[PDB]
Amino acid sequence: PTYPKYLLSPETIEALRKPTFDVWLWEPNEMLSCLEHMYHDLGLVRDFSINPVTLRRWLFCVHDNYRNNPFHNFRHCFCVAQMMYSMVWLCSLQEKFSQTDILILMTAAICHDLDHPGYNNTYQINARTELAVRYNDISPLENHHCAVAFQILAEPECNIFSNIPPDGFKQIRQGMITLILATDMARHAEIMDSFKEKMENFDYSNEEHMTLLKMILIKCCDISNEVRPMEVAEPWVDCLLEEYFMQSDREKSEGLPVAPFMDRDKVTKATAEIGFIKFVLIPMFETVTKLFPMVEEIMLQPLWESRDRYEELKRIDDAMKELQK
Amino acid sequence: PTYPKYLLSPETIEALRKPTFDVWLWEPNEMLSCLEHMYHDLGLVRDFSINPVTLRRWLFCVHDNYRNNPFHNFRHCFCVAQMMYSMVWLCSLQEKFSQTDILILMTAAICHDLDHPGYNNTYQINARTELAVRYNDISPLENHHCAVAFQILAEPECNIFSNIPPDGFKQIRQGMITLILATDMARHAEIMDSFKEKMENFDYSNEEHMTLLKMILIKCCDISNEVRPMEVAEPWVDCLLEEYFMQSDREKSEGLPVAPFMDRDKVTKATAEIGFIKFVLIPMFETVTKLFPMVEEIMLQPLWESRDRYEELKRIDDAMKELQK
Numbered sequence: 001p002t003y004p005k006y007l008l009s010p011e012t013i014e015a016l017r018k019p020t021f022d023v024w025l026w027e028p029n030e031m032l033s034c035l036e037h038m039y040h041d042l043g044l045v046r047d048f049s050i051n052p053v054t055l056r057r058w059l060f061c062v063h064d065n066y067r068n069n070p071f072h073n074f075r076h077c078f079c080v081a082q083m084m085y086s087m088v089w090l091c092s093l094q095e096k097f098s099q100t101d102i103l104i105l106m107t108a109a110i111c112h113d114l115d116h117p118g119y120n121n122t123y124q125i126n127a128r129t130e131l132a133v134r135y136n137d138i139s140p141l142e143n144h145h146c147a148v149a150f151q152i153l154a155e156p157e158c159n160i161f162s163n164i165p166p167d168g169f170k171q172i173r174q175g176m177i178t179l180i181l182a183t184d185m186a187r188h189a190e191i192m193d194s195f196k197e198k199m200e201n202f203d204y205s206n207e208e209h210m211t212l213l214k215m216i217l218i219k220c221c222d223i224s225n226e227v228r229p230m231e232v233a234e235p236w237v238d239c240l241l242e243e244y245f246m247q248s249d250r251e252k253s254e255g256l257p258v259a260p261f262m263d264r265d266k267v268t269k270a271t272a273e274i275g276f277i278k279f280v281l282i283p284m285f286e287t288v289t290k291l292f293p294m295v296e297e298i299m300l301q302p303l304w305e306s307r308d309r310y311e312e313l314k315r316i317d318d319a320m321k322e323l324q325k
Numbered sequence: 326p327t328y329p330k331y332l333l334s335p336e337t338i339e340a341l342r343k344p345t346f347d348v349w350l351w352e353p354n355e356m357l358s359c360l361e362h363m364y365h366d367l368g369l370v371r372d373f374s375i376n377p378v379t380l381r382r383w384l385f386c387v388h389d390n391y392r393n394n395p396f397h398n399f400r401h402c403f404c405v406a407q408m409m410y411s412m413v414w415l416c417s418l419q420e421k422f423s424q425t426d427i428l429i430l431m432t433a434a435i436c437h438d439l440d441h442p443g444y445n446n447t448y449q450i451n452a453r454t455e456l457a458v459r460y461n462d463i464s465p466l467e468n469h470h471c472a473v474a475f476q477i478l479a480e481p482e483c484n485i486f487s488n489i490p491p492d493g494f495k496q497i498r499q500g501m502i503t504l505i506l507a508t509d510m511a512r513h514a515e516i517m518d519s520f521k522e523k524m525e526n527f528d529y530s531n532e533e534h535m536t537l538l539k540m541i542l543i544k545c546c547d548i549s550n551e552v553r554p555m556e557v558a559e560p561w562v563d564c565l566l567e568e569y570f571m572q573s574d575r576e577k578s579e580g581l582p583v584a585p586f587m588d589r590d591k592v593t594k595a596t597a598e599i600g601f602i603k604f605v606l607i608p609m610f611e612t613v614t615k616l617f618p619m620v621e622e623i624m625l626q627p628l629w630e631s632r633d634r635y636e637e638l639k640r641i642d643d644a645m646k647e648l649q650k
């Protein structure tokens with residue numbers, strides 16, 4: 001007949017594999033179904049004996065632990081997971097990685113921003129919040145996302161790892177913690193340098209090389225909005241700035257230092273993306289392309305287009321600003 | 326947190342395997358989840374590469390195709406499938422039958438009464454309905470249920486058999502057809518005799534022996550209401566008579582022959598069930614017990630109790646009618 005929303009149509013299930021997927025057309029229950037589909041489709045439910053009902057409860061519990069922030073919310077979560085899922089197909093990751101690595105990449109993508117408060121690590125540290133005190137200024141937000149991830153998995157009803165032997169659990173936990181902690185942008189240059197070093201002679205059988213590759217993969221998915229079609233990416237930037245401005249305003253009326261890139265009076269959407277696309281995004285996907293050449297046409301290309309559109313927007317933007325001076 | 330109804334709790338999942346399960350407590354939405362669980366739990370999704378999303382669409386289309394009758398409705402459907410699922414565990418059917426047969430039993434059980442009009446074969450034939458004309462008076466209802474089942478399965482979006490080689494399809498289709506056509510009560514005596522004849526020296530290796538057993542199994546499940554706990558079974562009789570009375574009244578009004586067992590002026594819940602339990606139900610389950618002794622304690626016991634409870638109830642009825650004339 002005419003099936004209900006939570007029942008993904010074959011058209012949707014097909015599109016879910018490409019980075020062109022419109023993440024905005026869906027409501028939470030439909031996104032939860034997409035994530036569910038991903039675990040069955042990638043063979044994770046099968047190879048790890050994940051109880052299908054538990055998988056659902058777990059996703060629902062994960063959803064309940066994401067906050068209603070303009071950016072760091074459940075829909076961003078779904079974006080990272082969906083981009084990771086696309087990466088698996090685009091790069092044929094299942095010929096390079098074991099199912100355990102895939103489970104690690106996917107579960108970490110879904111759990112990487114759990115219970116994000118809407119204010120970054122710099123604010124946590126400068127404001128001496130309880131999280132900064134708890135984690136001693138060492139990537140407090142990411143450490144917290146992990147802890148929540150495993151407190152959730154500790155609940156028997158949500159433990160998608162119930163049937164994995166203990167050695168496997170430990171191996172998965174270690175991998176997830178490493179990936180989630182790697183998303184902290186403060187460590188971006190460090191992680192990039194290490195990867196590029198290993199990239200001089202990449203060894204798919206070297207465990208230390210794969211760890212760095214997985215860290216890069218989840219980092220790519222975490223800040224991959226600009227790779228998506230313009231109509232899908234555009235709104236995310238506004239959501240991010242809304243969050244950044246909120247923090248800068250708070251930092252100003254609290255006497256805490258304010259980062260220029262979050263300063264309402266110094267940053268423009270255009271100048272912001274241009275620099276981020278040319279000095280963070282493109283260089284990263286550029287090195288990843290050396291390993292997976294198909295990545296250039298599917299992701300480096302839309303980044304070049306995005307860079308050019310924002311450079312045009314910057315002209316008009318600066319013009320408008322002159323009239324207001 | 327607190328999970329929605331469509332996410333079965335582990336308590337429900339555990340009770341779903343026994344004939345004591347209370348079929349009246351759930352709404353279609355919930356029952357559909359149960360059926361879905363059954364396919365994953367029996368390993369049918371796994372062994373036949375059923376796309377889990379397709380499984381959901383298929384179950385939804387099946388639900389939409391059951392009519393809103395007092396008895397032959399989606400809930401009866403669920404009862405039959407749930408009783409079949411209970412028997413797979415109780416009798417350890419997975420030790421005697423291949424996965425292909427289990428799939429045949431479960432799917433036939435879910436589809437056996439699809440699009441039931443609410444008036445039995447005798448009515449279709451006597452009123453010379455389109456169905457009776459289409460099927461040449463040969464089990465018109467059963468032929469129609471089966472045709473609708475494969476109509477649904479022919480819709481790509483609902484084709485839970487999409488990943489089975491054609492030789493497998495043919496084997497599954499033929500089995501379902503045999504089973505669904507076997508549910509026509511007009512053939513009860515015939516089927517029972519053949520089964521008993523083979524029962525003289527049952528051979529789990531003889532395919533003709535196994536075909537009869539599967540026929541008896543689905544026949545048992547189809548009319549297994551009285552096997553359920555008194556409070557779960559009682560309301561079903563009212564639904565049945567409500568349908569029978571609707572037909573006899575109509576037959577009376579159109580001047581068509583009326584069957585005594587459906588006549589308001591002659592049937593009482595007690596008279597209806599006593600004979601049915603004593604001469605149809607008990608004998609059939611007695612034969613099945615010769616192969617699965619555990620059936621006696623789990624199913625004959627409650628049938629005996631229902632027989633006695635209804636017989637005693639009739640005495641109270643006769644004594645009451647006496648006290649009035």
Ligand SMILES: CC(C)Cn1c(=O)n(C)c(=O)c2nc[nH]c21
Pocket residue numbers: 185222223224225237240261272273276
């Ligand atoms: C400032 C930077 C570390 C954070 N950051 C980010 O995460 N995304 C996704 C952007 O699009 C972006 N644009 C500027 N900065 C950005």
Ligand SMILES: CC(C)Cn1c(=O)n(C)c(=O)c2nc[nH]c21
Pocket residue numbers: 510548565586597598601605
């Ligand atoms: C005995 C038969 C002719 C009529 N019949 C029947 O078909 N089913 C399924 C019943 O449950 C039933 N109960 C009484 N009569 C019944």
Ligand SMILES: [Mg+2]
Pocket residue numbers: 112113183
């Ligand atoms: Mg983050």
Ligand SMILES: [Mg+2]
Pocket residue numbers: 437438508
């Ligand atoms: Mg029937």
Ligand SMILES: [Zn+2]
Pocket residue numbers: 076080112113183222
């Ligand atoms: Zn993130």
Ligand SMILES: [Zn+2]
Pocket residue numbers: 401405437438547
């Ligand atoms: Zn029936």
